[PDB]
Ligand binder design. Structure first.
Ligand SMILES: NC(=O)c1ccc[n+]([C@@H]2O[C@H](COP(=O)([O-])OP(=O)(O)OC[C@H]3O[C@@H](n4cnc5c(N)ncnc54)[C@H](O)[C@@H]3O)[C@@H](O)[C@H]2O)c1
Length: 248
């Protein structure tokens, strides 16, 4: 096992109460970062803080990242809890319902874009402002393989994740002359997936050459390096976690 140092650094992790964000918070606490969990569910946040407290110092902020005003209230509350805001791992988002474009609900389309794309912009804006003021920052926007490939019957989700990738490329080059790294990750499906049929699971696994889904352990390990100081050159890039499926 590697060790990523985070002493003196503070991190914001949206969607940190469970799943990918929780696994990243668990690893950043091993690097002894100060972790602030952003999530919409106040109940899940309370269970996360209870599990993670024996691992280190953790704070929680209730916020809907698709509401820009709630994001503005969240970043100010976080400033009262930290000395600086050094790391952002944007993991909040929904999967959206599955439907062909010909049948997709306009309301569901707008809901997916607001949460998975507009929300990512709101969070990235207020956090990078602090990173600019301190001339330090590391950002990882957790996208998806769907953003690269355009999965059939998931157009809204795929379109939202592709915007997050372009947002990442744009924001990265805007801050390239500063000590700020802005990158994204395109993971495959994770072990959310239990609502699927077995035949549907066999189809998803047939597109992944490793024949298995990514473990939250493996995502958190790669995120931990991407938000460390040693990631001092690569920015506006996409790091893959698809197990051999992606071709670019
Ligand atoms: N798990 C997968 O198979 C998979 C695959 C590819 C990409 N992703 C992406 O990774 C992210 C989440 O992954 P996960 O496995 O941890 O899902 P999850 O359901 O286990 O957790 C998602 C968390 O984000 C929160 N959330 C949703 N909308 C929110 C909002 N407006 N404001 C604040 N919090 C909100 C949720 O409360 C939850 O805590 C998403 O961006 C997802 O698109 C997941």
């Amino acid at each position: 096992m590697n060790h990523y140092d985070f002493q003196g650094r503070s991190a914001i992790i949206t969607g940190g109460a469970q799943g990918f964000g929780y696994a990243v918070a668990e690893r950043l606490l091993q690097g002894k970062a100060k972790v602030v969990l952003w999530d919409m569910d106040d109940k899940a946040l309370a269970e996360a803080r209870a599990k993670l407290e024996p691992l280190g110092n953790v704070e929680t902020v209730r916020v809907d990242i698709s509401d820009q005003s709630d994001v503005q209230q969240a970043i100010e509350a976080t400033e009262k809890l930290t000395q600086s805001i050094d790391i952002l791992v944007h993991s909040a988002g929904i999967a959206g319902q599955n439907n062909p474009v010909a049948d997709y609900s306009p309301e569901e389309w707008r809901r997916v874009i607001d949460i998975d794309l507009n929300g990512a912009f709101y969070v990235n804006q207020v956090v990078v402002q602090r990173m600019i003021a301190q001339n330090y920052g590391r950002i990882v926007n957790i996208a998806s393989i769907a953003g690269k490939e355009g999965n059939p019957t998931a157009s809204a989700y795929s379109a939202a994740k592709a915007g997050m990738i372009a947002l990442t490329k744009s924001l990265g080059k805007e801050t390239a002359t500063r000590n700020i790294a802005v990158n994204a990750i395109t993971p495959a499906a994770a072990q959310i997936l239990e609502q699927c049929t077995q035949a549907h699971i066999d189809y998803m696994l047939s597109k992944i050459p490793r024949a298995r889904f990514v473990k939250v352990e493996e995502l958190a390990a790669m995120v931990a390096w991407l938000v460390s100081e040693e990631n001092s050159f690569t920015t506006a890039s996409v790091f893959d976690l698809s197990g051999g499926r992606a071709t670019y």
